[PDB]
Protein backbone atom coordinates (compact mmCIF):
# COMPACT_ATOMS: atom_id res chain seq x y z
CA UNK A 1 0.00 0.00 0.00
CA UNK A 2 3.05 2.30 0.19
CA UNK A 3 6.65 2.22 -1.05
CA UNK A 4 10.02 3.35 0.28
CA UNK A 5 12.96 3.57 -2.12
CA UNK A 6 16.55 3.32 -0.90
CA UNK A 7 19.07 5.37 -2.83
CA UNK A 8 22.86 5.56 -2.64
CA UNK A 9 23.89 7.94 -5.46
CA UNK A 10 27.41 7.69 -6.86
CA UNK A 11 26.96 10.52 -9.37
CA UNK A 12 24.84 13.68 -9.23
CA UNK A 13 22.51 12.48 -12.03
CA UNK A 14 21.52 9.42 -9.95
CA UNK A 15 20.39 11.75 -7.17
CA UNK A 16 18.35 13.45 -9.87
CA UNK A 17 16.41 10.21 -10.54
CA UNK A 18 15.16 10.48 -6.92
CA UNK A 19 12.80 13.21 -8.14
CA UNK A 20 10.94 10.67 -10.26
CA UNK A 21 10.14 8.44 -7.28
CA UNK A 22 8.91 11.46 -5.35
CA UNK A 23 6.69 12.51 -8.24
CA UNK A 24 5.29 8.98 -8.18
CA UNK A 25 4.40 9.35 -4.48
CA UNK A 26 7.23 7.27 -3.01
CA UNK A 27 9.33 8.20 0.02
CA UNK A 28 13.06 7.96 -0.63
CA UNK A 29 15.89 7.36 1.77
CA UNK A 30 19.05 8.91 0.35
CA UNK A 31 22.47 7.87 1.68
CA UNK A 32 25.13 10.32 0.42
CA UNK A 33 28.12 8.37 1.81
CA UNK A 34 29.61 8.00 -1.72
CA UNK A 35 29.49 11.73 -2.48
CA UNK A 36 32.19 14.28 -1.52
CA UNK A 37 30.98 16.76 1.12
CA UNK A 38 30.52 19.87 -1.05
CA UNK A 39 28.76 17.94 -3.81
CA UNK A 40 26.53 16.33 -1.17
CA UNK A 41 25.37 19.79 -0.04
CA UNK A 42 24.56 20.54 -3.69
CA UNK A 43 22.50 17.36 -3.94
CA UNK A 44 20.55 18.30 -0.81
CA UNK A 45 19.89 21.78 -2.26
CA UNK A 46 18.64 20.15 -5.48
CA UNK A 47 16.33 17.74 -3.61
CA UNK A 48 15.11 20.57 -1.37
CA UNK A 49 14.00 22.45 -4.50
CA UNK A 50 12.35 19.30 -5.81
CA UNK A 51 10.31 18.35 -2.72
CA UNK A 52 9.24 21.97 -2.11
CA UNK A 53 7.79 22.24 -5.63
CA UNK A 54 5.59 19.19 -5.06
CA UNK A 55 4.57 19.87 -1.47
CA UNK A 56 7.01 17.30 -0.12
CA UNK A 57 9.66 17.46 2.58
CA UNK A 58 13.34 16.66 3.10
CA UNK A 59 15.22 16.14 6.35
CA UNK A 60 18.50 14.73 7.59
CA UNK A 61 18.01 11.50 9.58
CA UNK A 62 21.69 10.71 10.23
CA UNK A 63 25.19 11.55 9.05
CA UNK A 64 25.04 11.80 5.24
CA UNK A 65 21.50 10.37 5.17
CA UNK A 66 18.27 12.13 4.28
CA UNK A 67 14.59 11.22 4.15
CA UNK A 68 12.75 12.77 1.20
CA UNK A 69 8.97 12.52 1.18
CA UNK A 70 6.12 13.50 -1.17
CA UNK A 71 2.98 15.21 0.15
CA UNK A 72 1.18 11.90 0.78
CA UNK A 73 3.71 10.84 3.45
CA UNK A 74 3.51 12.34 6.94
CA UNK A 75 6.70 12.37 9.06
CA UNK A 76 6.57 12.45 12.88
CA UNK A 77 9.07 12.17 15.74
CA UNK A 78 12.48 13.77 16.02
CA UNK A 79 16.10 12.76 15.45
CA UNK A 80 18.56 15.27 16.94
CA UNK A 81 22.16 15.93 15.84
CA UNK A 82 25.14 14.44 17.70
CA UNK B 1 -2.10 8.42 3.37
CA UNK B 2 1.00 6.90 5.04
CA UNK B 3 3.19 7.74 8.03
CA UNK B 4 6.90 7.51 8.83
CA UNK B 5 8.01 7.81 12.46
CA UNK B 6 11.51 8.97 13.38
CA UNK B 7 12.96 7.43 16.51
CA UNK B 8 16.17 8.14 18.43
CA UNK B 9 16.01 5.87 21.52
CA UNK B 10 18.03 6.82 24.59
CA UNK B 11 16.95 3.80 26.63
CA UNK B 12 16.05 0.26 25.58
CA UNK B 13 12.37 0.69 26.57
CA UNK B 14 11.99 3.56 24.08
CA UNK B 15 13.13 1.24 21.30
CA UNK B 16 10.41 -1.07 22.56
CA UNK B 17 7.74 1.58 21.83
CA UNK B 18 8.77 1.28 18.16
CA UNK B 19 6.83 -2.01 18.08
CA UNK B 20 3.59 -0.12 18.66
CA UNK B 21 4.05 2.07 15.57
CA UNK B 22 4.82 -1.01 13.50
CA UNK B 23 1.69 -2.75 14.78
CA UNK B 24 -0.22 0.36 13.72
CA UNK B 25 1.17 0.05 10.17
CA UNK B 26 3.77 2.83 10.33
CA UNK B 27 7.33 2.62 9.01
CA UNK B 28 9.92 3.68 11.58
CA UNK B 29 13.37 5.09 11.07
CA UNK B 30 15.51 4.22 14.09
CA UNK B 31 18.74 6.10 14.77
CA UNK B 32 20.76 4.26 17.44
CA UNK B 33 23.49 6.94 17.78
CA UNK B 34 22.67 7.40 21.51
CA UNK B 35 23.02 3.69 22.34
CA UNK B 36 26.31 1.92 23.19
CA UNK B 37 27.35 -0.59 20.50
CA UNK B 38 26.52 -3.87 22.29
CA UNK B 39 23.15 -2.59 23.49
CA UNK B 40 22.42 -1.36 19.96
CA UNK B 41 22.90 -4.91 18.63
CA UNK B 42 20.43 -6.08 21.28
CA UNK B 43 17.89 -3.49 20.15
CA UNK B 44 18.25 -4.63 16.53
CA UNK B 45 17.73 -8.27 17.63
CA UNK B 46 14.59 -7.20 19.52
CA UNK B 47 13.20 -5.26 16.54
CA UNK B 48 14.09 -8.13 14.19
CA UNK B 49 11.92 -10.44 16.33
CA UNK B 50 9.15 -7.85 16.31
CA UNK B 51 8.97 -7.19 12.55
CA UNK B 52 9.29 -10.90 11.71
CA UNK B 53 6.26 -11.75 13.88
CA UNK B 54 4.09 -9.26 11.99
CA UNK B 55 5.38 -9.90 8.48
CA UNK B 56 7.50 -6.75 8.50
CA UNK B 57 11.14 -6.10 7.71
CA UNK B 58 14.19 -4.44 9.22
CA UNK B 59 17.37 -3.27 7.50
CA UNK B 60 20.36 -1.05 8.16
CA UNK B 61 20.30 2.11 6.00
CA UNK B 62 23.43 3.77 7.40
CA UNK B 63 25.81 3.68 10.36
CA UNK B 64 23.66 3.14 13.48
CA UNK B 65 20.45 3.70 11.50
CA UNK B 66 17.76 1.18 10.61
CA UNK B 67 14.52 1.20 8.65
CA UNK B 68 11.79 -0.93 10.21
CA UNK B 69 8.67 -1.57 8.16
CA UNK B 70 5.32 -3.34 8.63
CA UNK B 71 3.91 -5.64 5.93
CA UNK B 72 2.03 -2.80 4.19
CA UNK B 73 5.28 -1.00 3.27
CA UNK B 74 7.37 -2.26 0.35
CA UNK B 75 11.11 -1.40 0.32
CA UNK B 76 13.11 -1.24 -2.93
CA UNK B 77 16.61 -0.19 -3.98
CA UNK B 78 19.88 -0.93 -2.24
CA UNK B 79 22.25 0.85 0.14
CA UNK B 80 25.63 -0.91 0.41
CA UNK B 81 28.08 -0.80 3.34
CA UNK B 82 31.16 1.47 3.31
Curated annotation (Swiss-Prot), chains A, B:
Major location category of this protein: cytoplasm
Any one of the GO CC terms: cytoplasm
Keywords (A to Z) from UniProt: Cell cycle, Cell division, Cytoplasm, Septation
Cytoplasm listed as a keyword: yes
A molecular-function term among this protein's GO annotations: identical protein binding
Ion transport in keyword set: no
Subcellular location: Cytoplasm
Quaternary context: Homodimer. Interacts with FtsZ.
UniProt function note: Cell division protein that is part of the divisome complex and is recruited early to the Z-ring. Probably stimulates Z-ring formation, perhaps through the cross-linking of FtsZ protofilaments. Its function overlaps with FtsA.
Protein name: Cell division protein SepF
Gene that this polypeptide is encoded by: sepF
Full-sequence range covered: 61 to 142 of 151
Amino acid sequence: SSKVVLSEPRVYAEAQEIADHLKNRRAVVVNLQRIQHDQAKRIVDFLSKTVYAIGGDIQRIGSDIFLCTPDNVDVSGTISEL
